[PDB]
Subunit: 148 residues, 6 copies
């Protein structure tokens, strides 16, 4: 209850990129997370549109994996209060980001699902799947998050 409320504030309301790319937390659990993204500016007519979409997709994947890593690490913090769990999210840092693109993005809205593969002591490995409006897989990702 308090976890979903705290996570929504941080991810939906407090990110200043919101003016250019919308973000909504659709699902959260210790094993799986789902974020939906909305391109407020679709970038039609830009000379490097495809290129710019590459960076947007990598950031979307990294963000989804960061929320998945948080849910994996907070699950292990069993008897800790909500303040210390919320403080831990600020220590999450990406160690490795591997993204393979299957086709061009070029869409208004896309969705990204993050599956927590294994959460060790310090490293949380997440596998991601990013699709468009039409339920078509456009990119897949392997992301490693650590506590710094």
């Amino acid at each position: 209850e308090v976890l979903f409320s705290a996570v929504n504030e941080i991810f939906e309301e407090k990110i200043p990129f919101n003016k250019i790319i919308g973000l909504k937390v659709r699902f959260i659990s210790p094993e799986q997370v789902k974020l939906s993204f909305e391109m407020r500016d679709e970038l039609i007519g830009n000379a490097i549109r495809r290129m710019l979409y590459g960076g947007v997709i990598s950031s979307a994947i990294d963000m989804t994996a960061g929320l998945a890593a948080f849910m994996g690490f907070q699950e292990k913090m069993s008897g800790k209060p909500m303040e210390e769990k919320l403080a831990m999210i600020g220590r999450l840092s990406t160690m490795s980001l591997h993204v393979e693109y299957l086709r061009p993005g070029l869409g208004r809205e896309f969705v990204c699902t993050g599956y927590n593969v294994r959460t060790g002591n310090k490293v949380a490995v997440i596998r991601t799947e990013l699709m468009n409006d039409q339920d078509e897989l456009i990119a897949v990702g392997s992301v490693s998050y650590i506590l710094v």
Copy 2:
């Protein structure tokens, strides 16, 4: 050279002025060549006190590496278009798409200005493999990247 200045000027317009993300993350083209490019970036909002600051910088770093790699890919492919005019070279940049983006982070960026250098390892017929190094204000290596671009 006459062709090198029209190439540099065309590229500067596309990357420095025409990108709409410039109002949140500034981008300047420091250097270009067929085998190496160099972009400098500036965080206009450093995101101090944001609960997921380190996380947001991960996405920023991955975008900067992808953009640097994209420009390096362009410089490799245009070199192979020897006898073609400048119009066809500029038109080709819209077909460049990322196939694979691998980024390894040594530490969290947490700096305002950072510079990224892209080295074109090999340019095949349809694939351009770029190796990148991203560093901060203080010339410290914060991330390295391997990026593959293709002509779609």
Copy 3:
């Protein structure tokens, strides 16, 4: 019925349906949602060919990809709990390899060899399979990581 008809439908497609059967034999030994096993047989030994080892590398990669494809199918059809067998068999046509990573240990250019496929994780769209390929004498000759998607 539904357990038996799966095994029968899968065997017909992989064993009898494949046209390369004259060149390379293929038999489904074991199937399950998490694990699968295929046995192979070289009908032509290729004894005398100057690029024999080179041809075997392609045979091994194809065997690994086929075993992974069967393993991917078993992972995806497990998630289709409420669907009928006509839709499950139609889904096998949608399976396409996204990434094939094979590591070769020792050239095991033998008549018969077996490949086992382990379903590491099946997401919504991607199925990651780990494979082990061994020869007549049970010696590991190659390992593989294969990613399959529903196109």
Copy 4:
């Protein structure tokens, strides 16, 4: 003589010698110490097979491995400057794949397709080749990283 006899010797081994020729055709289009190009042709379309895309994944990986094997050969024979042609042709039998990494973009299940192999770096024992596989319409359908060793 030595330039011409290399092309002729290589073509006989890859084009005429291979027994899979009835299933899949293979022609050597271009060869050099740094680059090679092979064109392929599906003799059987496989039109009607339920696991068509799955069979094509194996065909693509084999084509990539074969092209890389030819590219590896050209890299190693360049280093054998003072040796005769009998030793160079004997060396092709020692070529074995160590690692095969293939990434698939779009299913290009066409009749004809071409694969180009670039020799990235040839060390003392290891030859690393980068491959690009495209269809009739010049569209990139797969890329590959292949490592070959002299066994």
Copy 5:
């Protein structure tokens, strides 16, 4: 359990006393199980003032990860040997050989005592894939490893 103590005791002998490198890098078995192991290491000579100190620690870290992975591989394989005696389980450890060692370093170790935890991801018929995390005195992550072991 009777079998768990004879397994732990047999392993402790092989890793803590029988390794001849123990006079330069100490090794102690902190924890063992079929899905996870934990080894602690001690640099007896820290190599202070050596011109290539950081470099030498790279090799030490790679060995520690490989050893931790080897023990985790053993614990995975012996679990599959359910009805076999303790003699055959111990004999199997001599057939374990590293197939692939991938190590990513976050910072240079430069500490006396460091701990490495090995997690057995999957144990197939002939291959054991282990994920490792190596940390220092201060519980800071200095390196991560992916190691594959096979029965030769």
Copy 6:
């Protein structure tokens, strides 16, 4: 002249592992380096002999790659004195070490060749090949070195 003398001191004489594994610099150049190693204790009869050889091979590869990285970085230090070049070797640190083993080590003496693939500003990527007495490739490696 002075470079070969300085490198030999550091690698052959000043490494305390010398009592268990011998090391000799056979060749050095900006593009290629070669080290030969000697197992002073062959470890016959040890229960985890194969396992112990895995760690020795990874260290040998990492060391060869470190010397190759040094030769790549010092080449770029064109007009600098010998003292600053020698000081730079202390800043070399391994970032990534990838080793693939083709067969067991189990030999008295083995040789490792390091080829400098590309040396950028901060990263030096080295490809290694480790063989035994019989000229048989036993392991290959990809190693990344950085200046910290």
